[PDB]
Symmetry: C4
Subunit: 293 residues, 4 copies
């Protein structure tokens, strides 16, 4: 058998794998930052890993254009020359292969972030619709804010148990919500308080509003904020440049319509057109425009 | 009888109903957030509800285009197939029908916010003039800031009387203005202090300036700010994209004029035109431009 | 005698009166806000008032276009029908006519701000050059920041001596710089400290950065900040829209040059042009472009 | 001998001198602000000064266009009439010529900042590639942030040892990180803490996010922030206007492609083209576009 790459099955499968790549982009950075020391999430994480291996089999059994190539040997060799390496490294189950704690293993499972490359390949499918690229651009913004929230928590959590003298952002969070840290590192804020504060601070940093309660005090926190001010300004020159451009592209029929209507209105004023003729001019423009766009 | 939809009466009535929809958009969210436990506002609220019912009768008696249809049966059936459902639900007097406190009834009167749909329909009338769409866009910005101020006060007021341990924004407001809360929830800021601080914080959040005195500390306050940072950035890519585009559209005659004037100026420099001819060139451009735009 | 409106004298006089209007726009709001209870400023203020009266005489003796009109009666009648009223009210010496303190008289001298209308008239002269409209736009931004700094100090100074209980921005300034207010309103910050802090806060508010040390606490201070967030966002959609557009207009020769150069570069790549011909193509474009712009 | 200005040697040498100008732009302001009272930096600083003198010799031995001029006398005279003065003053070793402390001498070595003019000349080379002008624009932004960080530290360090009464930004930094100043000016933050805080504050000021921990309190600090709010807004109207324009220029093939594809898609919808013809239309557009761009 062989799947045609343009078929309605392969279209639905590629949009299903977009949602599983978004699951990887959320829960892999989160587990590596917040959770390092069956459940519904533990079985879902296995189901998703199985579907990312099934997608390797579909890539051995899909046609390609280089009109179409359909021979299984020329398909398999094209994948082995192309993306099979990255798609395989994104699937190696290192948790079953290494023993050196669950911290090393859970950090090594960040190799799953190579699944973002499956979305970077298939942009010919995903970018075709204006409403789909608006969904992509807002998910890219919300995922950059989330990955930075995981890095910001790693910077806090790698300094809170140190000889910090109560300066870093996690001690200040403990004081600000009335959940202070004891000297042994016991007590303190919950994982919900620490995650919600980290995500709040990185949306605050990226959108460039500082409400004054979370702020960087250690040199590592300040160097992280210098980097997020560089990222946030390149990202606003790119993402929110493109988001407004796609909104203005969706609005483009109406933007042209107002422009041509005002040219007709000024022509009507300049020639001082009488009402029995004027109605025929402006009703003709409405008929012609609604007919042809 | 039957109203022509293009008549000067129906034009004035549609602009009158825009101002009554703005009254609904201000005073319905405000009453549901700040006031839940005759006066000039109580009689005005009844007068406005009566005029929104009269508008249902005008919709049973207005022509429509599908050239015009004027038969009262084809008018009435078109409205029953179309918007009559939403226009009726926006007019059901639930305060006269339900008994379960004045809190439930006052919250249920938020069904009046369906009147915003009357403005979403009639955009063919309201968007025709550049100065009118500037008035709409600044009212949309000021109303989003006000609706968010009502949600932010609901988030504060649903946590201030809880076992909060004096963390949320209303306790901090009480301390900052020297009107502290007693343990029983007595004393505290006035409704003017709480409304002005809520509206100040949501214009602060939407325009992305944090002056440092109001800030989100509870997880619900931080999740609200994460949402207002997403809303504010999509809204600036849309509203303030469009506001500058309409200002640049109003300026477009002058923007073209400077561009053509500088082309003529560079042509005059490049050919080194003598003054007796140069004056005739640049005065001709001024005459021709002021004649034709 | 009669001045030709296009003469090199009238050109120099109109640019001199722009600088005297900027003096009025700075020192009239400043004196009315900060100074209300000879010196170099007192004699300069008289010299400037004399030159704004001389400009009324020049307006009785200047030609106008309605080709030119040069008859002194048709000049004088055109000015009496036009701007003479506003130009006269901008020159009435109320300090010599009224007695009711120096506070009323100094506030009434704000009638001099009508001199801003002389700049609003003569925009045909002042907007002709791209570098001059950049100077205007940055002076409009710096003057809006200064007028708002005078309003913000009036809001502070009308509440500091009240039964405020040490909440408003001037008490907090006194504490922050170690110059606290005594209970009698004695001590406190200097006029330099109060002006520099007011101007700092309004550039902070207009550019939407809040560094956290100055913040609005009273309802009047918060309502002022709600207004400056509305002004600042309309102003950025207008002034900094136009400033970037004028910078991009000054850059337009280079922006076209890169665009045409890259079209020629892609044509050269697509046809795979040999070097002996390629040099002639790209050197011709450099010669033709530097010849014609 | 004589170097051809277009040769692959002179191309590599001009890109090497760009990296040595960036070294000067970083380490000269840093040494003059932070370090004023062999090592790897002391020998690198001598090596760089030698290479900037070798570049004067290359300028005496390079052809120029005024087709090319290659005569060594006409080359040398063109350089003596042109840039030789500034290139020589950028190389005078004042440290070997003056004795009046190492503070005066180290401040006088800021004459090396004239090397930025070598980059301002050669923009015909450096601006040719879109990825190179993105590297320039982000280095200009990061260097403006660094030069302002050196000025901000000079403003702090010229007031910290004064009769300040613990108001200025360096005393507040000492308190915020638990490294307070003793009355003699001993103790306090390290040069890493002071530099990282100064650079953090100027990226914070330029990108218009104030996180609330560093803020200007003295009049000199507030006047510096008024200036950085003026610089940052002109710079965002220029640098981040241009950075988005170059990103949109790099994207321009794809932006045209989506626009033409949607015109073809709307033509196909409007004429209701049957599938056997539709495939030939849209595959032809893909073939023609991938052939010609």
């Amino acid at each position: 058998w062989t799947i045609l790459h343009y078929s309605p099955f392969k279209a639905v499968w590629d949009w299903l794998i977009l949602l599983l790549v978004i699951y990887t982009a959320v829960f892999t950075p989160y587990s590596a930052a917040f959770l390092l020391k069956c459940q519904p999430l533990a079985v879902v994480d296995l189901i998703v890993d199985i579907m990312f291996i099934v997608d390797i089999l579909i890539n051995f059994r899909t046609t390609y254009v280089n009109e179409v190539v359909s021979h299984p040997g020329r398909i398999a060799v094209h994948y082995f020359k192309g993306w099979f390496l990255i798609d395989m490294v994104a699937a190696i189950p290192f948790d079953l292969l290494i023993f050196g704690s669950e911290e090393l293993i859970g950090l090594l499972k960040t190799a799953r972030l190579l699944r973002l490359v499956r979305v970077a390949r298939k942009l010919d499918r995903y970018s075709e619709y204006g409403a789909a690229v608006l969904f992509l651009l807002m998910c890219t913004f919300a995922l950059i804010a989330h990955w930075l929230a995981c890095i910001w928590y790693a910077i806090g959590n790698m300094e809170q148990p140190h000889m910090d003298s109560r300066i870093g952002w996690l001690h200040n969070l403990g004081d600000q919500i009335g959940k202070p840290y004891n000297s042994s590192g016991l007590g303190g804020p919950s994982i919900k308080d620490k995650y919600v504060t980290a995500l709040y601070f990185t949306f605050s940093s990226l959108t460039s509003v500082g409400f004054g309660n979370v702020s960087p005090n250690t040199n590592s926190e300040k160097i992280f904020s210098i980097c997020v001010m560089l990222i946030g300004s390149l990202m606003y020159a790119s993402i929110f440049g493109n988001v407004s451009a796609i909104i203005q592209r969706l609005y483009s029929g109406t933007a042209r319509y107002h422009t041509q209507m005002l040219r007709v209105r000024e022509f009507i004023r300049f020639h001082q057109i009488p009402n029995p003729l004027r109605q025929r001019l402006e009703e003709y423009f409405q008929h012609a425009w609604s007919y042809t766009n």
